[PDB]
Amino acid sequence: MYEFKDYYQNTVQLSFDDQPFSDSPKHVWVICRFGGKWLLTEHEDRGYEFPGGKVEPMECAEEAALREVKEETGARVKSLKYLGQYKVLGKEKVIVKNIYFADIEKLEKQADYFETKGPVLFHELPENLSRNKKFSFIMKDSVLPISLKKLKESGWI
């Protein structure tokens, strides 16, 4: 596993094993690719990020991952694959977050995206990411480069 501090100084623990921190993660994060482009959403408060959010008690993690992609981007998924999991060791809370990879089939029109401004496509993520005020803090720690490295090694992209 990997351990590091995040953008807001919480400690994050990251693993590419199957649900090592929790069998019932309460959050999902979905790295999306549409053709040769990254598909992100623009969270209303946080800014650009891969879609994700909470796992409902009446949802399993995969169901929540598919719903967040659709709600935040209007995308239909061709394939959803579990990649890994991370634990965020916060000041007041500890959250366990599954990482999925979604290969996107298409983006359909949507009147609303919920807590976001909808889909954003990036041919490449910018190098200035960590100092880019337009990006979410969740994209500004080692979870993103380590996850992309593992994703590229997988053969899935």
Side-chain angles (χ1 to χ4, degrees), residues 37-59:
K37 297 172 181 292
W38 302 114
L39 170 67
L40 280 74
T41 184
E42 187 188 336
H43 181 270
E44 66 190 4
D45 302 331
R46 300 190 293 274
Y48 307 134
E49 56 187 33
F50 282 117
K54 290 189 150 172
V55 179
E56 293 302 323
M58 294 312 282
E59 269 177 338

Side-chain angles (χ1 to χ4, degrees), residues 15-32:
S15 171
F16 299 87
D17 286 344
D18 291 302
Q19 296 189 344
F21 311 109
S22 187
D23 294 313
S24 72
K26 320 120 300 288
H27 296 70
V28 296
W29 203 42
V30 188
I31 293 171
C32 297

Side-chain angles (χ1 to χ4, degrees), residues 10 13 20 26 41 47 52 62 79 88 100 105 111 119 126 138 141 145 155:
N10 302 306
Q13 299 185 327
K26 320 120 300 288
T41 184
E62 279 195 43
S79 68
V88 182
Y100 292 88
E105 178 200 10
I138 75 166
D141 60 42

Side-chain angles (χ1 to χ4, degrees), residues 51-154:
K54 290 189 150 172
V55 179
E56 293 302 323
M58 294 312 282
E59 269 177 338
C60 66
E62 279 195 43
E63 281 170 316
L66 294 167
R67 181 183 50 78
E68 290 298 347
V69 169
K70 187 193 73 192
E71 285 181 358
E72 303 188 340
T73 72
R76 267 61 192 179
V77 179
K78 201 159 83 245
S79 68
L80 184 83
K81 296 200 216 75
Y82 171 89
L83 179 64
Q85 187 183 85
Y86 62 105
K87 190 196 284 188
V88 182
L89 291 89
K91 249 83 174 282
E92 207 98 52
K93 288 160 92 157
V94 168
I95 62 149
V96 180
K97 195 149 170 170
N98 271 18
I99 305 162
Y100 292 88
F101 169 64
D103 187 17
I104 303 305
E105 178 200 10
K106 63 186 176 202
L107 266 53
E108 307 209 287
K109 204 171 88 176
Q110 217 166 264
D112 196 4
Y113 294 99
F114 305 71
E115 261 196 283
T116 80
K117 279 183 191 170
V120 190
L121 285 158
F122 280 89
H123 192 74
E124 53 185 59
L125 292 176
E127 308 265 279
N128 78 344
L129 219 154
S130 76
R131 322 172 305 269
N132 190 331
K133 293 174 205 186
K134 297 207 179 74
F135 275 78
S136 173
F137 75 94
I138 75 166
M139 297 288 283
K140 301 183 188 170
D141 60 42
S142 300
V143 176
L144 178 65
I146 298 170
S147 293
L148 293 183
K149 178 181 182 284
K150 290 283 177 165
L151 216 206
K152 289 173 191 180
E153 286 166 5
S154 71

